[PDB]
Design an enzyme around this catalytic site. Structure first.
Site, short mmCIF file in Angstrom:
data_model
loop_
_atom_site.label_atom_id
_atom_site.label_comp_id
_atom_site.label_asym_id
_atom_site.label_seq_id
_atom_site.Cartn_x
_atom_site.Cartn_y
_atom_site.Cartn_z
N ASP A 135 -20.77 -79.72 89.06
CA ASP A 135 -21.59 -80.78 89.54
C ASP A 135 -21.06 -81.84 89.63
O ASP A 135 -21.50 -83.22 89.98
CB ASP A 135 -23.17 -80.22 89.14
CG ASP A 135 -23.31 -80.65 88.06
OD1 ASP A 135 -22.65 -80.37 87.23
OD2 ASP A 135 -25.00 -80.21 87.66
N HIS A 180 -29.88 -76.49 79.64
CA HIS A 180 -30.74 -76.96 79.70
C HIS A 180 -32.39 -76.43 78.71
O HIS A 180 -33.03 -76.89 78.71
CB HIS A 180 -31.57 -77.65 81.20
CG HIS A 180 -29.82 -78.95 81.49
ND1 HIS A 180 -29.92 -80.07 81.64
CD2 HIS A 180 -29.49 -78.54 82.89
CE1 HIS A 180 -28.74 -80.82 81.74
NE2 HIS A 180 -28.75 -79.54 82.82
N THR A 217 -27.03 -78.56 62.24
CA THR A 217 -26.29 -78.13 61.52
C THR A 217 -24.02 -78.68 61.59
O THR A 217 -24.43 -78.77 62.86
CB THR A 217 -26.24 -76.85 61.48
OG1 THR A 217 -25.29 -76.00 61.08
CG2 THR A 217 -25.63 -76.43 62.97
N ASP A 229 -19.23 -79.78 77.06
CA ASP A 229 -19.40 -79.24 78.05
C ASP A 229 -19.02 -80.18 79.25
O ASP A 229 -19.54 -81.36 79.41
CB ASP A 229 -21.61 -79.82 77.88
CG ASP A 229 -22.24 -79.81 78.46
OD1 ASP A 229 -22.21 -79.87 79.69
OD2 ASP A 229 -23.49 -78.84 78.63
N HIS A 252 -24.26 -82.80 84.06
CA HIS A 252 -25.69 -83.48 82.99
C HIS A 252 -25.66 -83.06 81.61
O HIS A 252 -24.82 -82.33 81.18
CB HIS A 252 -26.19 -82.52 83.36
CG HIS A 252 -27.26 -83.15 85.25
ND1 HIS A 252 -26.62 -81.46 86.32
CD2 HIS A 252 -28.28 -84.02 85.55
CE1 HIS A 252 -27.47 -81.97 87.36
NE2 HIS A 252 -27.68 -83.07 87.97
N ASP A 304 -19.97 -80.39 82.33
CA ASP A 304 -20.66 -79.89 83.57
C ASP A 304 -21.60 -82.33 84.40
O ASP A 304 -21.05 -82.29 83.28
CB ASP A 304 -22.57 -79.32 83.12
CG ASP A 304 -23.61 -79.04 84.04
OD1 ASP A 304 -23.48 -78.20 84.53
OD2 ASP A 304 -24.53 -80.37 84.02
C1 LIG Z 1 -30.25 -80.27 87.11
C2 LIG Z 1 -31.41 -80.55 87.75
C3 LIG Z 1 -32.98 -80.63 87.21
C4 LIG Z 1 -34.00 -81.05 87.35
O1 LIG Z 1 -35.24 -80.92 87.67
C5 LIG Z 1 -33.28 -82.48 88.30
C6 LIG Z 1 -32.15 -82.80 88.84
O2 LIG Z 1 -31.47 -83.47 89.49
O3 LIG Z 1 -31.01 -82.06 88.74
CA LIG Z 2 -21.88 -82.10 80.77
NA NA Z 3 -24.61 -79.60 65.59
ZN LIG Z 4 -25.26 -80.04 85.80
#
Ligand SMILES: Cc1cc(O)cc(=O)o1
Ligand SMILES: [Ca+2]
Ligand code: NA
Ligand SMILES: [Zn+2]
Length: 369
Positions: free
Chosen positions: A259, A136, A185, A169, A173, A171
């Site tokens: 997560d 992030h 790019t 990714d 998020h 994750d």
């Molecule tokens: C990874 C993350 C950061 C945040 O500020 C809030 C949340 O829920 O999750």
């Molecule tokens: Ca992800």
């Molecule tokens: Na790209």
């Molecule tokens: Zn995450």
């Protein structure tokens, strides 16, 4: 395609950095992971390296001079003097000031860039940095518990010797900071699977596809609460196979944020450790230089299980479900097993939803040369 040489990065100081009372991000989980995999004997099968500390100058290959000067200067004892700067750089709330913050960033980043150099030199097939994956962080601000984008810096290292690099990714998020760095790019394709809808960070709609020379080189699979191993497996191998065929990368970076597991304190998905690790197995079968990184994960017993099993998968080394004795054994009760069960939460991702989103992403991939 043979067994692979693995180089693994760990600093024994990493578990002592503390985000503060009540904060869900716990660097201790990286020490728990290390201690568990040592007790399974996995040190006999791989090379273990300490990361160097990345310098402020190395970090400015991506981040602004002003942001890095602030991160290397800010401390709990001088916070009052820096009120304005803390707000500009989004530090002091979700991304707190803590003792040794800059050193933590230097070690997280050092593992990722050291692994990238080892891959470029053809001295390993896979490199692993469970303290990295902090997807992030932005050019000039902290976000989502992340301060320095170790992933962007490692990819810039790989681009010295690789024309096309693929980023994946898993994750829960959206990988916003990595996508933004490479949005215009075609030399980096970014592929993120994530919860989308009233959820942090708010980006990663399936209609976000890149821009300019990078149009069609950002790929986003938005998901609802409760996805399970069967549903994720429905779409991951077909998507990654088509990306490999059309994009033909010469190196890969896989962010393995934990997560997305069942029972996570912040997450809302229902994957097991076996379902998460199937993603590592799929990517490994393409036989490309591979950097495996950490990320989120807030139920720390399950983070340690996940990254221990994914290290074993990288090594093609079967390990028993019965956990070996270790310094954190009591954290793994009441069962003391490696693998986890899914919950009875509802899967809001219907099979029809999963196939329809996959079909729209396949349409966009036909636009590559
Ligand atoms: C990874 C993350 C950061 C945040 O500020 C809030 C949340 O829920 O999750
Ligand atoms: Ca992800
Ligand atoms: Na790209
Ligand atoms: Zn995450």
């Amino acid at each position: 395609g043979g067994k692979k040489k693995v180089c693994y990065y760990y600093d024994g100081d990493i578990g002592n950095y503390y985000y503060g009372q009540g904060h869900p991000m716990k660097p201790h989980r990286i020490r728990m992971t290390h201690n568990l995999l040592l007790n399974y004997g996995l040190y006999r099968k791989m090379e273990i390296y300490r990361p160097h500390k990345a310098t402020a100058e190395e970090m400015t290959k991506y981040h602004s001079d002003e942001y890095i000067k602030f991160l290397r200067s800010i401390r709990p004892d001088n916070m009052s003097e820096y009120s304005k700067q803390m707000q500009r750089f989004n530090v002091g709330e979700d991304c707190p000031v803590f003792d040794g913050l800059f050193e933590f960033c230097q070690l997280s980043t050092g593992g990722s860039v050291a692994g990238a150099v080892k891959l470029n030199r053809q001295q390993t097939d896979m490199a692993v940095n469970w303290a990295g994956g902090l997807h992030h962080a932005k050019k000039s601000e902290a976000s989502g518990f992340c301060y320095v984008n170790d992933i962007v810096l490692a990819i810039l290292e790989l681009l010295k010797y690789h024309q096309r690099v693929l980023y994946i990714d898993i994750d829960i998020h959206h990988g916003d900071g990595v996508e933004e760095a490479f949005y215009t790019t075609d030399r980096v394709m970014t592929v993120s699977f994530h919860k989308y809808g009233e959820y942090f960070p708010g980006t990663g709609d399936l209609r976000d596809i890149g821009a300019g020379k990078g149009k069609y080189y950002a790929v986003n699979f938005p998901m609802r609460d409760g996805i399970d191993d069967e549903s994720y497996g429905q779409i991951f191998k077909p998507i990654i196979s088509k990306v490999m065929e059309m994009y033909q990368p010469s190196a890969v970076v896989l962010q393995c944020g934990a997560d997305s597991l069942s029972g996570d304190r912040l997450g809302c998905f229902n994957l097991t450790v076996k379902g998460h690790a199937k993603c590592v197995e799929v990517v490994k079968t393409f036989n490309l230089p591979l950097l495996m990184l950490g990320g989120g994960g807030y139920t720390i017993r399950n983070v340690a299980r996940c990254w221990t099993y994914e290290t074993a998968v990288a090594l093609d080394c079967e390990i028993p479900n019965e956990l070996p004795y270790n310094d954190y054994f009591e954290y793994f009760g009441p069962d003391f097993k490696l693998h986890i069960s899914p919950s009875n939460m509802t899967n809001q991702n219907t099979p029809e939803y999963m196939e329809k989103i996959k079909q729209r992403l396949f349409e966009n991939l036909r636009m590559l040369p």
